[PDB]
Chains A and B, each alone.
Chain A
């Protein structure tokens, strides 16, 4: 995932689940990318869809 433009204050509101390397389901790209910023970039994408 390209998070090179985050953190972003405003996100679109689609539900597009992503499964992180932390075993948590992120609701969409914008939530995932802000969570990548929050993890100090340790978080990666395990797969597309729910964990």
Chain B
């Protein structure tokens, strides 16, 4: 399992962000709105193969969360599909980026704005978001935004879809890495 792959809570499906570690302890990052209220995560829609357990969540204000692996068998690739990830970096306007998610697969575009405020309603406001022109659909939440070998963000939300186009917002990954003292590998 690697960045963009399907992950399953008890109520639905989001996407794995990045595989990360601290010392010998392996986790994955995902969206905070996915981890909020979720405990256990599974690798399959039958919910018979456990991935691990929610270890942290920051939604609203930010949109990141982390899941500790409990499954020793499942491969934990330090990649986004076939793309090796070897560092993290902050987003810049115009940056060439790619998003991967479990609904729509891999889509490429560019960072259009930084520090967006996105009001999802009901007090769920997120600050400091990366804005892009890449489309995304339900199930893509939590999926990586990357630029070559550099991790950049985690899929939060957006407007539109991958048929007519849309705009997607991303939680800067560096803030998630700092929060939990974890690193990409």
**Chain A interface residues (CB < 8 Å from chain B):** 2, 5-6, 8-17, 27-28, 30-31, 48
Contact = CB atoms under 8 A, between A and B. Distances in A.
A5 B141 contact: no
Contacts, number: 69
Interface stretch (B16-24, B79-87, B153-161): B153-161
A19 to B, nearest CB: 13
B11 to A, nearest CB: 5
Instruction: Give me the 5 closest cross-chain CB pairs, A-B, nearest first.
Output: A27-B138, A15-B139, A13-B141, A16-B12, A15-B13
Nearest to B119: A10
Contact of A13 (B119, B124, B137): B137
The CB with the most chain A CB atoms within 10 A, among B121, B124, B141, B155, is that of: B121
A9 to B, nearest CB: 5
A30 to B, nearest CB: 8
Interface in B31-85: 31, 33-34, 63
B161 to A, nearest CB: 10
A42 B109 CA distance: 38
Chain B CB within 10 Å, residue with most, of A10, A27, A31: A10
B169 interface: yes
Interface in B83-123: 101-103, 118-122
Contact of A10 (B11, B137, B140, B157): B157
